[PDB]
Design a protein around this ligand. Structure first.
Ligand code: CL
Ligand code: MG
Ligand code: ZN
Length: 186
């Protein structure tokens, strides 16, 4: 099972977050988003990682009883940008250099882009992710919560930093965030 251990590493790596289409709960460390819509995830570092640094996104099941199962789309949502394979839950929007990878040992999917410097007008680098299947989809996540694990890696795949967040893909992310936050209070 892929580690979800937070690891700021030598570069001080950590994530930040911004009709609601995507909303992040700091209290829950949980992103709520609509199907296939833009999810801006910010990459923050204290110092600039070397040339060739890469950023990988991968989904895992949050519950220990499901951690060994590969997160994939349900059959219905398999059937596009002509780049993300139809089985991949997570895709990147707006990056000409996205790589879609299947682990040969674990069968897990991931998407990698080069680590780029912050865009003009921003103190951080933002990646736009899309989630291609609902949390509730029978045959896919089937109501099981997931984590997205973001790893900062060197050009050879070695770990430089790690952070993570829970995700719910749902039709009414603002309402679902409110319900889960109010339920946490009560
Ligand atoms: Cl659900
Ligand atoms: Mg955090
Ligand atoms: Zn689905």
């Amino acid at each position: 099972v892929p580690s979800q251990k937070t690891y700021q590493g030598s570069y001080g790596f950590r994530l930040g977050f911004l009709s609601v289409t995507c909303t992040y709960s700091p209290a829950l460390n949980k992103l709520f988003c609509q199907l296939a819509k833009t999810c801006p995830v910010q990459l923050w570092v204290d110092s600039t990682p070397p040339p060739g640094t890469r950023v990988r996104a991968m989904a895992i099941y949050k519950q220990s009883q499901h951690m060994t199962e590969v997160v994939r789309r349900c059959p219905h949502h398999e059937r596009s940008d002509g780049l993300a394979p139809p089985q991949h839950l997570i895709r990147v929007e707006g990056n000409l250099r996205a790589e879609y990878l299947d682990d040969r040992n674990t069968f897990r999917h991931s998407v990698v882009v080069p680590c780029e410097p912050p865009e003009v007008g921003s103190d951080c680098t933002t990646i736009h992710y899309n989630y291609m299947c609902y949390s509730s989809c029978m045959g896919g996540m089937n109501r099981r919560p997931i984590l997205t694990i973001i790893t900062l890696e060197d050009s050879s795949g070695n770990l430089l930093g790690r952070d993570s967040f829970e995700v719910r893909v749902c039709a009414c992310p603002g309402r679902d965030r409110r319900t889960e936050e109010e339920n946490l209070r009560k």
